[PDB]
Amino acid sequence: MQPPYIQERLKSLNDIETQLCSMLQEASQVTFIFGELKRGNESVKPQFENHVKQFYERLDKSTTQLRKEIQLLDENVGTRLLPINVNKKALGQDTEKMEEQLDLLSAILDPSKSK
Amino acid sequence: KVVKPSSLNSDKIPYVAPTKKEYIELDILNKGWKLQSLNESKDLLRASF
């Protein structure tokens, strides 16, 4: 599985597009409410301020968090996930495919474990 | 081919005397058309969203 850092980076990105979807939905409801506000029933007038404020605050902080994600693309070059060289796997495929084969021989060698 | 073109020549006609009668009706009729455009605007935006 992928190392820790990438998992929360993808979680944050997923939160970003879910917030964008919520912003689009709230745009839909505010467009809906403005229609009847123009039709001239004043009951839903208080809800308009709340919808506008929530729409703007959803638009702002989403873009703000996407700013942090692009800073993290620039800043994580060779960083947090530090290098490692303990045999490199493109070569070391020869080594796991050594080990497991001998393991099979052991299973073949002992007739009491073949059950 | 239809005709040698000299068709449109400048001419003068006076402006009709204004009154309350047609501008207030026209501007409230235009309010009416733009309230319809707002309605169609909201409906199209809702469908798109």
UniProtKB/Swiss-Prot annotation, chain A:
It is found in: Nucleus. Changing residue 17 to K: Results in a decrease of TFIIK and RNA polymerase II occupancies at active promoters. GO terms for biological process: negative regulation of transcription by RNA polymerase II; positive regulation of transcription by RNA polymerase II; positive regulation of transcription elongation by RNA polymerase II; positive regulation of transcription initiation by RNA polymerase II; RNA polymerase II preinitiation complex assembly. The keyword Transcription applies. GO terms for cellular component: core mediator complex; mediator complex; nucleus. The keyword Transcription applies. GO terms for molecular function: TFIIH-class transcription factor complex binding; transcription coactivator activity. Residues 56-107 form a coiled coil. InterPro entries: Mediator_Med11. Pfam families: Med11. Keywords: Activator, Coiled coil, Nucleus, Transcription, Transcription regulation. Present with 396 molecules/cell in log phase SD medium. Belongs to the mediator complex subunit 11 family. Component of the Mediator complex, a coactivator involved in the regulated transcription of nearly all RNA polymerase II-dependent genes. Mediator functions as a bridge to convey information from gene-specific regulatory proteins to the basal RNA polymerase II transcription machinery. The Mediator complex, having a compact conformation in its free form, is recruited to promoters by direct interactions with regulatory proteins and serves for the assembly of a functional pre-initiation complex (PIC) with RNA polymerase II and the general transcription factors. Component of the Mediator complex, which is composed of at least 21 subunits that form three structurally distinct submodules. The Mediator head module contains MED6, MED8, MED11, SRB4/MED17, SRB5/MED18, ROX3/MED19, SRB2/MED20 and SRB6/MED22, the middle module contains MED1, MED4, NUT1/MED5, MED7, CSE2/MED9, NUT2/MED10, SRB7/MED21 and SOH1/MED31, and the tail module contains MED2, PGD1/MED3, RGR1/MED14, GAL11/MED15 and SIN4/MED16. The head and the middle modules interact directly with RNA polymerase II, whereas the elongated tail module interacts with gene-specific regulatory proteins. This is Mediator of RNA polymerase II transcription subunit 11.
UniProtKB/Swiss-Prot annotation, chain B:
It is found in: Nucleus. Component of the Mediator complex, a coactivator involved in the regulated transcription of nearly all RNA polymerase II-dependent genes. Mediator functions as a bridge to convey information from gene-specific regulatory proteins to the basal RNA polymerase II transcription machinery. The Mediator complex, having a compact conformation in its free form, is recruited to promoters by direct interactions with regulatory proteins and serves for the assembly of a functional preinitiation complex with RNA polymerase II and the general transcription factors. Belongs to the Mediator complex subunit 17 family. Component of the Mediator complex, which is composed of at least 21 subunits that form three structurally distinct submodules. The Mediator head module contains MED6, MED8, MED11, SRB4/MED17, SRB5/MED18, ROX3/MED19, SRB2/MED20 and SRB6/MED22, the middle module contains MED1, MED4, NUT1/MED5, MED7, CSE2/MED9, NUT2/MED10, SRB7/MED21 and SOH1/MED31, and the tail module contains MED2, PGD1/MED3, RGR1/MED14, GAL11/MED15 and SIN4/MED16. The head and the middle modules interact directly with RNA polymerase II, whereas the elongated tail module interacts with gene-specific regulatory proteins. Present with 1720 molecules/cell in log phase SD medium. This is Mediator of RNA polymerase II transcription subunit 17. It comes from Saccharomyces cerevisiae (strain ATCC 204508 / S288c). The chain holds residues 247 to 295 of 687 of the full protein.
